[PDB]
Design a protein around this ligand. Structure first.
Ligand code: SF4
Ligand code: NI
Ligand SMILES: [Zn+2]
Length: 729
């Protein structure tokens, strides 16, 4: 019933088909499928038809195939009928329909060829090294979903071929990274950007895939979105294409001299709804309106692609000397690249947002008080105290901690600006490159001002930013800040699931996970780990129409498992009626659903009488016989999964942590690093439960084993309480 092809209806008037383009696509699709045919036959000769084949760290087999036709490719023989089908759908008649089918066959061919390449890939002997990615694992797709759902990443650019010259490559890519687009790069443009010292790699959301058929690692990335968050069944071809067209705002930049295989791959992009913009001149018989178009002027090609795709960018439009955007949030500034640092146990530091009255503030006044960063030798240090005063008619003291959180992100988005921690434990660094470009502390203050005004227009009327660098002045002001921090800690201490009468929904991820609803209570953070009850409450109070809504706690059904009719009704209504009940204190019956951005996954193991937990960053097998990525393929997508649940890491430290299932006492296995990340809260909560602070050492981890038979003897020897608790079944 989904007629996806309707989006093409007006594109080409009959009898004027661009036969030059369609012949090139046909030749390239024949070439790609032939490449795959011969490599596959040779591989079956060498290894045998039953040899396993696949990609590293994915739940979705060969994802392009798994999405569009649903096959669970596991061995070489499985790909033989699939490729035979794709070659069969490549047809000489020069229609737009046959061109799109040839592009789909080209994507299938490139995916097959790449899986064959990975037949030689092992961790000890890998076929790709950073900053190149090749196939991108599921955890990376998931780790960036939270930035996609609110269009912090506004769209995706697939750049194929070669820019006119190195300098043009750096120009457009710097532009795109400042706009926050996710980049996929293929062929000679990568070396062009590295030659120009552009930052690239998974940490900068700018993926150097490789060359040639590695282009398909853009496609199998994009299609996993619908398979993961969208919950769309494998093989629902038009449903997947519709999800891509509506939610994955990707386009292709086709740079350099054209070639048949690159053109056929680009037509596969068009086949799933992504337009193609090339820097090459195009004769009338080699173009399609709004789908395969020429913009030779490098000063316009980015805006042209964004307009044809429908991407609208919000910019602060302050003249900063450095680039700014999500790609730089993940950067590290090594000591040898550091021009100056503040805080981090080297010098005193704090940051503070505070409400003030109308008379108390000069809107827009950004002032540095003390020496600036040109006063130190490179590698030097200064104190820093950042005070952001805010006035507004709708400003509340409650909002102060919320706004203060943003300083971290606001700072880290600066290229060559870096920030970690919070309050009086901040550590800030500024790169030598940023200093060389003219960055000074005034620019940090201006960035904070503009960003606070842009993000909170309805509660911020005046903003003033003062940055202090005198050591004794910073130490004096830090005590005022610490008074505010203690008031905030006391307000937090007053909260509990029982003491508040209203929990809050979070629908932010419904952009990509339409049936999923999060419920945030004081003692259960949202599964992303970034939205606590105070956060959701402030977000609603700032924007009553937004994706966080109050829900009264009314109509109790089960005090023990945590079920109320008010939450049941809200979830059912906002679930497209897929979900009727939710228990807040158990994973074993009506668990809360997940999108796919969960920091960790819990699962029950009957053989161990207890829970395993595994975080997204952990690589390795778990005692349930599944890696994190496989478990995540089951747990996400907005379906209810008794015995499994997605969670935020900090929820493990909550007093209400799966309380009806036994809480922390029920946890028998976690990765060693995750326990270390949470060691203090695990020790404190275990003491509160009566488990002992050494309970953390009774929790098995991968150094104990990855299977039940390795783990159970250790649990028995340790006298883990879970073995003597009631089975949860
Ligand atoms: S609280 Fe839930 S719905 Fe909201 S952003 Fe986090 S994971 Fe997504
Ligand atoms: Ni999610
Ligand atoms: Zn999500």
């Amino acid at each position: 019933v989904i007629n996806f092809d309707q989006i093409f209806e007006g594109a080409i008037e009959p009898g004027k088909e661009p036969k030059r383009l369609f012949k090139e696509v046909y030749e390239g699709a024949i070439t790609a499928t032939s490449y795959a045919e011969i490599l596959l036959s040779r591989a079956i000769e060498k290894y045998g038809p039953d040899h396993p084949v696949g990609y590293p760290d994915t739940a979705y087999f060969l994802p392009v195939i798994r999405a569009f036709s649903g096959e669970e490719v596991r061995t070489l023989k499985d790909m033989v009928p699939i490729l035979n089908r794709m070659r069969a759908q490549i047809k000489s008649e020069l229609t737009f329909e046959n061109a799109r089918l040839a592009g789909e066959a080209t994507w299938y061919a490139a995916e097959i060829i790449e899986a064959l390449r990975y037949l030689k890939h092992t961790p000890e002997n890998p076929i790709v090294v950073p900053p190149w990615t090749g196939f991108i694992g599921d955890p990376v797709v998931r780790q960036y979903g939270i930035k996609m759902v609110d269009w912090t990443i506004p769209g995706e650019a697939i750049i194929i071929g070669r820019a006119k010259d190195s300098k043009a490559a750096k120009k457009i890519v710097d532009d795109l990274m400042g706009k926050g687009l996710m980049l996929f790069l293929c062929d000679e443009i990568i070396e062009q950007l590295l030659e120009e010292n552009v930052k690239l790699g998974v940490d900068y959301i700018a993926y150097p895939l490789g060359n040639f058929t590695q282009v398909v690692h853009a496609a199998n990335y994009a299609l996993r979105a619908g398979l993961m968050f969208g919950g769309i069944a494998p093989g629902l071809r038009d449903a997947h294409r519709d999800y891509q067209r509506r939610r994955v705002l990707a386009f292709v930049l086709y740079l350099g001299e054209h070639d048949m295989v690159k053109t056929a791959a680009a037509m596969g992009a068009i086949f799933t709804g992504f337009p193609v913009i090339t820097d090459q001149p195009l004769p009338e018989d080699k173009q399609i309106k709004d789908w395969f178009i020429s913009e030779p002027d490098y000063d316009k090609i980015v805006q042209t692609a964004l307009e044809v795709r429908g991407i609208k960018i919000t910019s602060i439009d302050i003249d900063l000397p450095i680039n700014f955007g999500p790609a730089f949030e993940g950067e590290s500034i090594r000591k040898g690249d550091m021009h100056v640092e503040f805080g981090g146990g080297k010098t005193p530091s704090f940051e503070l947002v505070r409400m003030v009255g109308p008379d108390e503030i000069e809107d827009g006044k950004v002032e540095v008080i003390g020496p600036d960063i040109d006063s130190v030798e490179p590698g030097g240090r200064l104190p820093i105290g950042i005070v952001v005063d805010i006035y507004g008619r709708k400003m509340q003291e409650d909002f102060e901690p919320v706004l203060e959180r943003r300083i971290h992100y606001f700072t880290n988005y600066g290229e060559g600006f870096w920030h970690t921690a919070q309050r009086d434990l901040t550590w800030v660094r500024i790169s030598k490159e940023a200093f060389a470009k003219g960055a000074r502390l005034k620019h940090l203050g201006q960035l904070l001002y503009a960003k606070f005004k842009q993000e909170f227009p309805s509660i911020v009327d005046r903003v003033q930013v003062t940055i202090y660098t005198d050591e004794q002045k910073v130490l004096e002001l830090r005590e005022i800040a610490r008074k505010k921090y203690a008031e905030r800690d006391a307000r937090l201490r007053e909260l509990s699931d029982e003491a508040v009468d209203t929990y809050y929904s979070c629908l932010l991820c419904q952009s990509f996970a339409p049936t999923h609803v999060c419920i945030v209570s004081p003692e259960r953070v949202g599964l992303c780990g970034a939205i606590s009850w105070l956060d959701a409450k402030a977000a609603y109070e700032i924007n009553p129409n937004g994706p966080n809504q109050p829900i009264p706690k009314e109509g109790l059904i089960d005090p023990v498992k945590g079920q109320w009719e008010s939450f049941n009704e809200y979830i059912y209504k906002n679930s497209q009626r897929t979900i009727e009940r939710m228990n807040l204190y158990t994973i074993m019956e009506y668990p809360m659903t997940s999108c796919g951005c969960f920091e960790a996954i819990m699962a029950y193991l009957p053989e161990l009488n207890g829970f395993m937990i595994v975080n997204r960053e952990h690589s390795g097998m778990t005692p349930i016989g599944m890696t994190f990525s496989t478990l995540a393929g089951m747990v996400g997508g907005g379906t209810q999964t008794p015995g499994f649940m997605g969670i935020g890491k900090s929820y493990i430290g909550s007093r209400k942590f799966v309380k009806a299932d036994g809480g922390l006492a029920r946890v028998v296995w976690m990765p060693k690093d995750l326990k270390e990340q949470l060691r203090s809260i695990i020790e404190e909560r275990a003491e509160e439960e009566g488990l002992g602070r050494d309970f953390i050492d009774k929790i098995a981890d991968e150094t104990v084993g990855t299977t039940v038979d390795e783990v159970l003897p250790f649990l028995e020897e340790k006298g883990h309480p879970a073995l003597s608790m009631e089975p949860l079944l």
